[PDB]
Amino acid sequence: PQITLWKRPLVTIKIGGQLKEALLDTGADDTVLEEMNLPGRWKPKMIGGIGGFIKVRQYDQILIEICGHKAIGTVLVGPTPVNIIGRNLLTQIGCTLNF
Amino acid sequence: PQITLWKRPLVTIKIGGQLKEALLDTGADDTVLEEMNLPGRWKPKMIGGIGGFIKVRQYDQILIEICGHKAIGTVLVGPTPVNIIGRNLLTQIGCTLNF
Numbered sequence A, B: 001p002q003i004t005l006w007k008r009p010l011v012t013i014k015i016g017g018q019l020k021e022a023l024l025d026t027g028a029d030d031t032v033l034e035e036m037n038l039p040g041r042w043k044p045k046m047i048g049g050i051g052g053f054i055k056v057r058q059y060d061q062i063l064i065e066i067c068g069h070k071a072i073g074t075v076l077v078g079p080t081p082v083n084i085i086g087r088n089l090l091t092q093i094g095c096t097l098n099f
Ligand SMILES: CCOP(=O)(COc1ccc(C[C@H](NC(=O)O[C@H]2CO[C@H]3OCC[C@H]32)[C@H](O)CN(CC(C)C)S(=O)(=O)c2ccc3ncsc3c2)cc1)OCC
Pocket: A023, A025, A026, A027, A028, A029, A030, A031, A032, A047, A048, A049, A050, A051, A052, A053, A081, A082, A084, A086, B025, B027, B028, B029, B030, B031, B032, B047, B048, B049, B050, B081, B082, B084, B086
């Protein structure tokens, strides 16, 4: 669909079998979700944002559905203020910006 | 234009008489720019993201040209790691997300 930006671009995602709300974020290289239990192995990682660096759990090759579009890729889990879908998954669902 | 997300969506902008590179960021409510000495009045503000908050100066009714499309609105100036064009200005150039 065509999503305008007068409101935050929030969508429903399905991950690890559960529904969550997340922000489509073209300024995020990577997808970062709030603390959650995810099955699978993970490794410690660091990511930086506007205010500094945080510690996250990096889960590779995770299935995630974004408005009924399937993606499989890296998901970082940590103390982000909001669930954000980054370019690593936006590219998989074919998202582009247009003006 | 159409902007794919394989790479960070960086574009040229014109602000306060100067040219800069900035990120088109649907996850940003507001527009945040690297330190610059813009004329006029401003108000202090704190904006938060991953890693915490930064202190910024809020300037009102600032004109920015984004790839030829003009916008007028609030601009926040502070020690951000990158120039970020947020939804408050993206809406004005009619930028949408499409997948
Ligand atoms: C030189 C680089 O240095 P650097 O690496 C960090 O650079 C950066 C810093 C910030 C951004 C933009 C943000 N991206 C992000 O955090 O993405 C992370 C996940 O994927 C990775 O890729 C890029 C970073 C990693 C988001 O799009 C927008 N944010 C909000 C969301 C909800 C969190 S916002 O900026 O916090 C923001 C903007 C306006 C606003 N108005 C009111 S609130 C408010 C909050 C891109 C790059 O670390 C230095 C220590």
